[PDB]
PDB file of all heavy atoms in Angstrom:
ATOM      1  N   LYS P  61       7.721  11.663 -10.790  1.00 62.81           N
ATOM      2  CA  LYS P  61       7.333  11.198 -12.088  1.00 62.81           C
ATOM      3  C   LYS P  61       5.843  11.163 -12.252  1.00 62.81           C
ATOM      4  O   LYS P  61       5.307  10.162 -11.660  1.00 62.81           O
ATOM      5  CB  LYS P  61       8.053   9.916 -12.306  1.00 62.81           C
ATOM      6  CG  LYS P  61       8.846   9.736 -13.525  1.00 62.81           C
ATOM      7  CD  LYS P  61       8.047   9.765 -14.818  1.00 62.81           C
ATOM      8  CE  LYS P  61       8.898   9.210 -15.869  1.00 62.81           C
ATOM      9  NZ  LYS P  61       9.116   7.736 -15.755  1.00 62.81           N
ATOM     10  N   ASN P  62       5.121  12.123 -12.754  1.00 63.20           N
ATOM     11  CA  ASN P  62       3.700  11.868 -13.075  1.00 63.20           C
ATOM     12  C   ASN P  62       3.415  10.777 -14.063  1.00 63.20           C
ATOM     13  O   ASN P  62       4.015  10.780 -15.194  1.00 63.20           O
ATOM     14  CB  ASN P  62       3.112  13.174 -13.456  1.00 63.20           C
ATOM     15  CG  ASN P  62       1.607  13.167 -13.568  1.00 63.20           C
ATOM     16  OD1 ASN P  62       0.936  12.775 -12.689  1.00 63.20           O
ATOM     17  ND2 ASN P  62       1.071  13.695 -14.645  1.00 63.20           N
ATOM     18  N   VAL P  63       2.597   9.786 -13.810  1.00 65.07           N
ATOM     19  CA  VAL P  63       2.331   8.712 -14.692  1.00 65.07           C
ATOM     20  C   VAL P  63       0.829   8.458 -14.579  1.00 65.07           C
ATOM     21  O   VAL P  63       0.144   8.960 -13.757  1.00 65.07           O
ATOM     22  CB  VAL P  63       3.177   7.421 -14.334  1.00 65.07           C
ATOM     23  CG1 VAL P  63       4.730   7.700 -14.201  1.00 65.07           C
ATOM     24  CG2 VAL P  63       2.784   6.862 -12.922  1.00 65.07           C
ATOM     25  N   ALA P  64       0.352   7.535 -15.452  1.00 62.43           N
ATOM     26  CA  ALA P  64      -1.032   7.195 -15.526  1.00 62.43           C
ATOM     27  C   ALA P  64      -1.218   6.151 -14.424  1.00 62.43           C
ATOM     28  O   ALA P  64      -0.339   5.333 -14.211  1.00 62.43           O
ATOM     29  CB  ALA P  64      -1.390   6.609 -16.820  1.00 62.43           C
ATOM     30  N   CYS P  65      -2.389   6.198 -13.706  1.00 62.23           N
ATOM     31  CA  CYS P  65      -2.721   5.159 -12.817  1.00 62.23           C
ATOM     32  C   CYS P  65      -3.150   4.025 -13.691  1.00 62.23           C
ATOM     33  O   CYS P  65      -3.633   4.183 -14.833  1.00 62.23           O
ATOM     34  CB  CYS P  65      -3.830   5.541 -11.948  1.00 62.23           C
ATOM     35  SG  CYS P  65      -3.430   7.025 -11.044  1.00 62.23           S
ATOM     36  N   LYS P  66      -3.158   2.836 -13.065  1.00 63.59           N
ATOM     37  CA  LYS P  66      -3.514   1.644 -13.731  1.00 63.59           C
ATOM     38  C   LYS P  66      -4.932   1.622 -14.331  1.00 63.59           C
ATOM     39  O   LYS P  66      -5.282   0.897 -15.259  1.00 63.59           O
ATOM     40  CB  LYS P  66      -3.535   0.380 -12.818  1.00 63.59           C
ATOM     41  CG  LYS P  66      -2.219  -0.271 -12.635  1.00 63.59           C
ATOM     42  CD  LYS P  66      -2.672  -1.399 -11.661  1.00 63.59           C
ATOM     43  CE  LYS P  66      -1.632  -2.253 -10.947  1.00 63.59           C
ATOM     44  NZ  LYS P  66      -1.210  -3.366 -11.794  1.00 63.59           N
ATOM     45  N   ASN P  67      -5.789   2.461 -13.770  1.00 65.15           N
ATOM     46  CA  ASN P  67      -7.123   2.603 -14.238  1.00 65.15           C
ATOM     47  C   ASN P  67      -7.459   3.728 -15.132  1.00 65.15           C
ATOM     48  O   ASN P  67      -8.644   3.982 -15.472  1.00 65.15           O
ATOM     49  CB  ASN P  67      -8.036   2.696 -13.045  1.00 65.15           C
ATOM     50  CG  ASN P  67      -8.041   3.959 -12.316  1.00 65.15           C
ATOM     51  OD1 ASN P  67      -7.011   4.713 -12.147  1.00 65.15           O
ATOM     52  ND2 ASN P  67      -9.217   4.263 -11.766  1.00 65.15           N
ATOM     53  N   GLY P  68      -6.462   4.530 -15.628  1.00 63.42           N
ATOM     54  CA  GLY P  68      -6.751   5.633 -16.479  1.00 63.42           C
ATOM     55  C   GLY P  68      -6.619   6.985 -15.876  1.00 63.42           C
ATOM     56  O   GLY P  68      -6.584   8.052 -16.475  1.00 63.42           O
ATOM     57  N   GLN P  69      -6.607   7.149 -14.519  1.00 62.04           N
ATOM     58  CA  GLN P  69      -6.598   8.418 -13.936  1.00 62.04           C
ATOM     59  C   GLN P  69      -5.220   9.022 -13.983  1.00 62.04           C
ATOM     60  O   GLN P  69      -4.270   8.281 -13.603  1.00 62.04           O
ATOM     61  CB  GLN P  69      -7.112   8.277 -12.438  1.00 62.04           C
ATOM     62  CG  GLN P  69      -8.587   7.765 -12.302  1.00 62.04           C
ATOM     63  CD  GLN P  69      -9.085   8.017 -10.865  1.00 62.04           C
ATOM     64  OE1 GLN P  69      -9.350   7.021 -10.104  1.00 62.04           O
ATOM     65  NE2 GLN P  69      -9.321   9.214 -10.487  1.00 62.04           N
ATOM     66  N   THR P  70      -5.098  10.282 -14.210  1.00 66.31           N
ATOM     67  CA  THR P  70      -3.853  10.967 -14.410  1.00 66.31           C
ATOM     68  C   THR P  70      -3.044  11.384 -13.102  1.00 66.31           C
ATOM     69  O   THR P  70      -1.972  11.960 -13.240  1.00 66.31           O
ATOM     70  CB  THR P  70      -4.351  12.253 -15.269  1.00 66.31           C
ATOM     71  OG1 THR P  70      -5.044  11.709 -16.337  1.00 66.31           O
ATOM     72  CG2 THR P  70      -3.217  13.067 -15.795  1.00 66.31           C
ATOM     73  N   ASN P  71      -3.488  10.949 -11.931  1.00 70.53           N
ATOM     74  CA  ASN P  71      -2.925  11.534 -10.734  1.00 70.53           C
ATOM     75  C   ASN P  71      -1.925  10.687  -9.938  1.00 70.53           C
ATOM     76  O   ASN P  71      -1.814  10.811  -8.723  1.00 70.53           O
ATOM     77  CB  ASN P  71      -4.105  12.065  -9.866  1.00 70.53           C
ATOM     78  CG  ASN P  71      -4.892  10.995  -9.164  1.00 70.53           C
ATOM     79  OD1 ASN P  71      -5.143  10.962  -7.988  1.00 70.53           O
ATOM     80  ND2 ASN P  71      -5.400   9.905  -9.785  1.00 70.53           N
ATOM     81  N   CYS P  72      -1.317   9.719 -10.676  1.00 68.79           N
ATOM     82  CA  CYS P  72      -0.301   8.825 -10.057  1.00 68.79           C
ATOM     83  C   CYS P  72       1.131   9.314 -10.236  1.00 68.79           C
ATOM     84  O   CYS P  72       1.461   9.983 -11.310  1.00 68.79           O
ATOM     85  CB  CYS P  72      -0.469   7.450 -10.602  1.00 68.79           C
ATOM     86  SG  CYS P  72      -1.828   6.551  -9.783  1.00 68.79           S
ATOM     87  N   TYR P  73       2.025   9.029  -9.315  1.00 69.06           N
ATOM     88  CA  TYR P  73       3.376   9.461  -9.400  1.00 69.06           C
ATOM     89  C   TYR P  73       4.341   8.268  -9.035  1.00 69.06           C
ATOM     90  O   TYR P  73       3.843   7.391  -8.240  1.00 69.06           O
ATOM     91  CB  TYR P  73       3.570  10.617  -8.364  1.00 69.06           C
ATOM     92  CG  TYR P  73       2.663  11.817  -8.638  1.00 69.06           C
ATOM     93  CD1 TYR P  73       1.429  11.889  -8.015  1.00 69.06           C
ATOM     94  CD2 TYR P  73       3.071  12.781  -9.568  1.00 69.06           C
ATOM     95  CE1 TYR P  73       0.594  12.851  -8.386  1.00 69.06           C
ATOM     96  CE2 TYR P  73       2.210  13.802  -9.965  1.00 69.06           C
ATOM     97  CZ  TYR P  73       0.953  13.835  -9.394  1.00 69.06           C
ATOM     98  OH  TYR P  73       0.103  14.734  -9.776  1.00 69.06           O
ATOM     99  N   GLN P  74       5.553   8.135  -9.685  1.00 68.80           N
ATOM    100  CA  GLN P  74       6.413   7.106  -9.195  1.00 68.80           C
ATOM    101  C   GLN P  74       7.732   7.628  -8.725  1.00 68.80           C
ATOM    102  O   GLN P  74       8.272   8.644  -9.200  1.00 68.80           O
ATOM    103  CB  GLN P  74       6.811   6.033 -10.352  1.00 68.80           C
ATOM    104  CG  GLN P  74       7.381   6.510 -11.598  1.00 68.80           C
ATOM    105  CD  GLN P  74       7.671   5.303 -12.557  1.00 68.80           C
ATOM    106  OE1 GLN P  74       8.838   4.810 -12.527  1.00 68.80           O
ATOM    107  NE2 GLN P  74       6.840   4.810 -13.389  1.00 68.80           N
ATOM    108  N   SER P  75       8.267   6.917  -7.719  1.00 68.50           N
ATOM    109  CA  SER P  75       9.423   7.327  -7.060  1.00 68.50           C
ATOM    110  C   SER P  75      10.588   7.383  -8.064  1.00 68.50           C
ATOM    111  O   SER P  75      10.696   6.521  -8.983  1.00 68.50           O
ATOM    112  CB  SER P  75       9.754   6.464  -5.890  1.00 68.50           C
ATOM    113  OG  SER P  75       9.773   5.038  -6.176  1.00 68.50           O
ATOM    114  N   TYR P  76      11.484   8.361  -7.949  1.00 71.71           N
ATOM    115  CA  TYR P  76      12.745   8.332  -8.749  1.00 71.71           C
ATOM    116  C   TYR P  76      13.601   7.194  -8.307  1.00 71.71           C
ATOM    117  O   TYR P  76      14.272   6.518  -9.113  1.00 71.71           O
ATOM    118  CB  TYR P  76      13.401   9.700  -8.704  1.00 71.71           C
ATOM    119  CG  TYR P  76      12.695  10.877  -9.316  1.00 71.71           C
ATOM    120  CD1 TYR P  76      12.860  12.156  -8.889  1.00 71.71           C
ATOM    121  CD2 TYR P  76      11.871  10.668 -10.455  1.00 71.71           C
ATOM    122  CE1 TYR P  76      12.368  13.256  -9.548  1.00 71.71           C
ATOM    123  CE2 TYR P  76      11.245  11.836 -11.069  1.00 71.71           C
ATOM    124  CZ  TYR P  76      11.527  13.054 -10.587  1.00 71.71           C
ATOM    125  OH  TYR P  76      10.946  14.206 -11.273  1.00 71.71           O
ATOM    126  N   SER P  77      13.627   6.924  -7.009  1.00 67.89           N
ATOM    127  CA  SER P  77      14.548   5.912  -6.390  1.00 67.89           C
ATOM    128  C   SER P  77      13.746   4.627  -6.153  1.00 67.89           C
ATOM    129  O   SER P  77      12.592   4.450  -6.580  1.00 67.89           O
ATOM    130  CB  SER P  77      14.956   6.441  -5.129  1.00 67.89           C
ATOM    131  OG  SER P  77      13.911   6.746  -4.338  1.00 67.89           O
ATOM    132  N   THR P  78      14.327   3.488  -5.646  1.00 68.37           N
ATOM    133  CA  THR P  78      13.698   2.274  -5.366  1.00 68.37           C
ATOM    134  C   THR P  78      13.290   2.242  -3.815  1.00 68.37           C
ATOM    135  O   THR P  78      14.089   2.790  -3.108  1.00 68.37           O
ATOM    136  CB  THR P  78      14.386   0.996  -5.757  1.00 68.37           C
ATOM    137  OG1 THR P  78      15.780   1.087  -5.272  1.00 68.37           O
ATOM    138  CG2 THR P  78      14.462   0.869  -7.232  1.00 68.37           C
ATOM    139  N   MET P  79      12.221   1.761  -3.415  1.00 65.96           N
ATOM    140  CA  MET P  79      11.885   1.741  -2.021  1.00 65.96           C
ATOM    141  C   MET P  79      11.536   0.346  -1.499  1.00 65.96           C
ATOM    142  O   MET P  79      11.090  -0.519  -2.314  1.00 65.96           O
ATOM    143  CB  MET P  79      10.657   2.673  -1.718  1.00 65.96           C
ATOM    144  CG  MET P  79      10.874   4.063  -2.198  1.00 65.96           C
ATOM    145  SD  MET P  79       9.431   5.161  -1.881  1.00 65.96           S
ATOM    146  CE  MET P  79      10.591   6.504  -1.524  1.00 65.96           C
ATOM    147  N   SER P  80      11.835   0.176  -0.267  1.00 64.31           N
ATOM    148  CA  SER P  80      11.601  -1.117   0.413  1.00 64.31           C
ATOM    149  C   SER P  80      10.114  -1.176   0.618  1.00 64.31           C
ATOM    150  O   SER P  80       9.473  -0.220   1.089  1.00 64.31           O
ATOM    151  CB  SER P  80      12.209  -1.077   1.789  1.00 64.31           C
ATOM    152  OG  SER P  80      11.784  -2.109   2.668  1.00 64.31           O
ATOM    153  N   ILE P  81       9.488  -2.324   0.255  1.00 64.70           N
ATOM    154  CA  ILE P  81       8.079  -2.607   0.186  1.00 64.70           C
ATOM    155  C   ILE P  81       7.849  -4.004   0.497  1.00 64.70           C
ATOM    156  O   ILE P  81       8.571  -4.886   0.083  1.00 64.70           O
ATOM    157  CB  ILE P  81       7.516  -2.191  -1.163  1.00 64.70           C
ATOM    158  CG1 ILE P  81       8.370  -2.711  -2.351  1.00 64.70           C
ATOM    159  CG2 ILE P  81       7.367  -0.657  -1.226  1.00 64.70           C
ATOM    160  CD1 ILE P  81       7.415  -3.553  -3.348  1.00 64.70           C
ATOM    161  N   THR P  82       6.809  -4.410   1.183  1.00 64.83           N
ATOM    162  CA  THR P  82       6.431  -5.863   1.440  1.00 64.83           C
ATOM    163  C   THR P  82       5.113  -5.948   0.785  1.00 64.83           C
ATOM    164  O   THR P  82       4.155  -5.329   1.233  1.00 64.83           O
ATOM    165  CB  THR P  82       6.292  -6.224   2.796  1.00 64.83           C
ATOM    166  OG1 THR P  82       7.305  -5.812   3.695  1.00 64.83           O
ATOM    167  CG2 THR P  82       6.227  -7.774   2.879  1.00 64.83           C
ATOM    168  N   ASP P  83       5.066  -6.696  -0.296  1.00 65.18           N
ATOM    169  CA  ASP P  83       3.771  -7.082  -0.978  1.00 65.18           C
ATOM    170  C   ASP P  83       3.182  -8.142  -0.113  1.00 65.18           C
ATOM    171  O   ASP P  83       3.956  -9.055   0.272  1.00 65.18           O
ATOM    172  CB  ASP P  83       3.969  -7.585  -2.348  1.00 65.18           C
ATOM    173  CG  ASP P  83       4.088  -6.603  -3.541  1.00 65.18           C
ATOM    174  OD1 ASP P  83       3.559  -5.541  -3.460  1.00 65.18           O
ATOM    175  OD2 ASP P  83       4.741  -6.799  -4.516  1.00 65.18           O
ATOM    176  N   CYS P  84       1.875  -8.216   0.009  1.00 63.30           N
ATOM    177  CA  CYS P  84       1.204  -9.302   0.748  1.00 63.30           C
ATOM    178  C   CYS P  84       0.010  -9.808  -0.048  1.00 63.30           C
ATOM    179  O   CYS P  84      -0.834  -8.902  -0.460  1.00 63.30           O
ATOM    180  CB  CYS P  84       0.543  -8.854   2.066  1.00 63.30           C
ATOM    181  SG  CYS P  84       1.622  -8.082   3.268  1.00 63.30           S
ATOM    182  N   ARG P  85      -0.056 -11.081  -0.437  1.00 64.59           N
ATOM    183  CA  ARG P  85      -1.200 -11.522  -1.254  1.00 64.59           C
ATOM    184  C   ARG P  85      -1.890 -12.715  -0.557  1.00 64.59           C
ATOM    185  O   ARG P  85      -1.213 -13.522   0.122  1.00 64.59           O
ATOM    186  CB  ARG P  85      -0.782 -11.990  -2.619  1.00 64.59           C
ATOM    187  CG  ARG P  85       0.597 -12.506  -2.828  1.00 64.59           C
ATOM    188  CD  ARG P  85       1.389 -11.434  -3.526  1.00 64.59           C
ATOM    189  NE  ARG P  85       1.011 -11.242  -4.890  1.00 64.59           N
ATOM    190  CZ  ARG P  85       1.133 -10.068  -5.640  1.00 64.59           C
ATOM    191  NH1 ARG P  85       1.500  -8.921  -5.053  1.00 64.59           N
ATOM    192  NH2 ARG P  85       0.926 -10.212  -6.925  1.00 64.59           N
TER     193      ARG P  85
END
Side-chain angles (χ1 to χ4, degrees):
Chain P
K61 229 296 195 68
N62 188 49
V63 306
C65 303
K66 273 182 191 273
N67 74 329
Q69 299 191 246
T70 308
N71 73 129
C72 280
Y73 300 89
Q74 53 178 272
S75 56
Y76 292 155
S77 58
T78 46
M79 302 186 142
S80 167
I81 46 126
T82 314
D83 273 329
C84 302
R85 30 255 283 152

